Amino acid sequence: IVETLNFLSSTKIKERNNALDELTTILPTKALSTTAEALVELLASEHTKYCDLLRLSLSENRLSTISYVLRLFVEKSCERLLLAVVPELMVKDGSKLVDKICEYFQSQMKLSMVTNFISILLNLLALDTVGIFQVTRTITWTVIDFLRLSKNTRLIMSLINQLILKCHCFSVIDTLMLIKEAWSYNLTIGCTSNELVQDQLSLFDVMSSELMNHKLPYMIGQENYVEYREYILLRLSNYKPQLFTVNHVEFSYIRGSRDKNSWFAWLKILGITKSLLTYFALNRKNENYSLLFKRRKCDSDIPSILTFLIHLLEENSSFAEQLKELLFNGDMARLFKVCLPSCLLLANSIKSDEKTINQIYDLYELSNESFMLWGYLQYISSADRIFEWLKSKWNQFCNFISWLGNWDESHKIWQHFQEQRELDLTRYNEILYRLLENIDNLCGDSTFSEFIAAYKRTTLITIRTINVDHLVLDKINMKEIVNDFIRMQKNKSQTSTIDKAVRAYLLKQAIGEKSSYNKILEEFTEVLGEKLLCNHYSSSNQAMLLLTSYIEAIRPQWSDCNDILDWIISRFEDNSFTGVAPTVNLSMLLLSLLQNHDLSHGSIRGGKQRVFATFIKCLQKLDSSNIINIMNSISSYMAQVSYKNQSIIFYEIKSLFGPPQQSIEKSAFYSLAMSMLSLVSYPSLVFSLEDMMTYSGFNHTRAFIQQALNKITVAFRYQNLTELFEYCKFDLIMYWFEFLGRYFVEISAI
């Protein structure tokens, strides 16, 4: 049946899914296996074919060999709910659940081979920011940096997500979760990279693009260079201090950046600032073959003299900023430089009329806010004249503002405004913004005139081919900034424009919305699974939002029936299988609802349901804790239950180091009456060393002073310890941070 399987794979027949549709039915035997594997438009057979070629240990080896490389790996690169759990188990076997198997593959990889995919995996790790083993998620650095220097910008760029925080010693147990969240959030790497590239052009000029990640990876490792897995730890640490990966390739790559540095170079005199003073810095490091960062290299070079960018990078270690952020006769001399130039940056840093005019005239010929405002900061009649000329020459954003920052200006504006009043619509929108920016007899007159002019100018701006598209002749451009709100709504609705939808629903609105929600729900029920996983989470998250929205509607209408609708949805959604990490919000919604109200125990049940939810620990607990704390309601029964739940999370010791962080948070849980004792008890439960002493320092700092110096609670906590076998002459020594304990707890002992 091989001929049939080949024909079934054969792409082209309805978007090449025809191969996938045939596969769904298939799911001669070897041929059938290839046909079922086609589920991937067809290219998901080669692995089946490898097994077929073997036609039984060899068939398994062949399929596995091919899975690694036969065709496209149908969500196999990083597996992208029981089927997925099985895939994770298979992954552990393949390395020879998900997190677990991670520790098997990383290890295997560290010990042998495993570049863009590896860098992407490094980025995936950054997005992970933890691991169900850690080592399997840390000890990869060996083979890592190995094949690394062993041997485009994008691979280095992917490596950067991990490199950015390639350091140890700090807010642990939570730092990993935070790293994961940030690195995953940046995961949207793409259009955003293009935006950063656009910002780079705005920023000044360096090189291609897709190199910001490439330089960021290097900058972070360079910071490290400038600076029992612990022994080998410090060992390889000093190594990377002078050993990492690919130093020749990077040196060549750096030339683009070096060119940018050369471009960056009275300021004009500095163009030849000691020829290659920078070379001295490089030589100091290269000669050291180890150096002493801090600035020793800088010291070798340097060229100070009577900079902004300097202090900038200094602290770092607006376009440029946003890039990294996202990732993670003097008057005449100046005017001449300004006329040539940019000028705005120098003028802005500095925060004579004819001199100003020479530069303003050059700016006028060039004809924005940066120059206009930088000039305003000096508040030049001659330059004002050039500014009027600038309007004539022009024949972003701001313009009039500088006027506000600093009656000829009004007249020039009036003339320009008149010209604008005379797509005209685009000019009119800019004029309206400019008028606000500069916010005066002319202005009053203009307010009236502008209302008429704007109405007249607007026409010039002029679903898929109708309800939205009809507006697009204008809106495609008119909406591209449109301070108002309407295009964002169209873009979002797909998943004034808003006003019309609002009007369509317009407590009465809740009833209209309920009917609409029911229709959407019916469609969702019919879809019941499909996205192949995306639908799952999407459903879990949507369900959380929808049930929450229905409850919110009751609150706004108040009505209550909407909360009942939320409950019905929640009940349907209680079937479990909460969407992968998608149900996280749901559990969160359930917890929020439990806090918000319940008047029927349901809150207690919701809390239990959330308590039973999964996750690589950390995070959710913290959020919930904070939320609950932000609650008073005098009593003494719920708090006790909450304390008991928190305590349940005190066992196992060892990783107490994580518990110490939790304890600082527990103490900094508004503490108040009683609970201080509970926070103290939590601390008593574990000892990753003076961990408590540090946790107490942090909690105390939140409440002033630190640890023992901020004990106070000791008046009772020492008694709690006094009550203990060892007593206060064995525990309070740590609390005091022994004879110290015997003294610290003497009254407690009595």
Partner: protein, 125 residues
């Protein structure tokens, strides 16, 4: 209520020690946090319950020491205490004086300003 039951055995009960306890509480929640302040708020009500002794025009510090940040874990408490105090200042001899008023006004006018939500219980007091 065991602490209360033990406290109930008020052998040699007097009056003046109340003062110490009140000033102790004022310091404790002048700092720390809202949860502590909430704990103290409950304690303040208990102190008032405990304050069986009274001396009309000689007490004075019926309010005064009550002129605390009536916000967060205090707005309701201050109101409860102030309202309760207002009842006390009406009850029996009443002994509704006034040489504390300037400060009461400072707190009233700001806390009833801010978000401008005074509540009718204020006006009734």
């Amino acid at each position: 209520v065991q602490t209360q039951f033990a406290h109930e055995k008020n052998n040699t009960h007097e009056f003046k020690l109340l003062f110490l306890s009140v000033i102790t509480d004022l310091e404790k929640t002048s700092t720390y946090i809202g949860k502590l302040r909430c704990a103290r708020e409950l304690k303040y009500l208990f102190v008032l319950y405990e304050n069986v002794l009274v001396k009309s025009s000689t007490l004075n510090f019926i309010i005064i020491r009550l002129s605390k940040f009536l916000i967060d874990t205090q707005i309701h408490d201050e109101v409860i205490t102030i309202f309760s105090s207002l009842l006390n200042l009406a009850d029996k001899n009443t002994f509704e004086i006034e040489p504390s008023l300037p400060n009461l006004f400072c707190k009233i006018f700001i806390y009833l300003r801010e978000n401008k939500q005074l509540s009718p219980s204020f006006q009734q007091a």
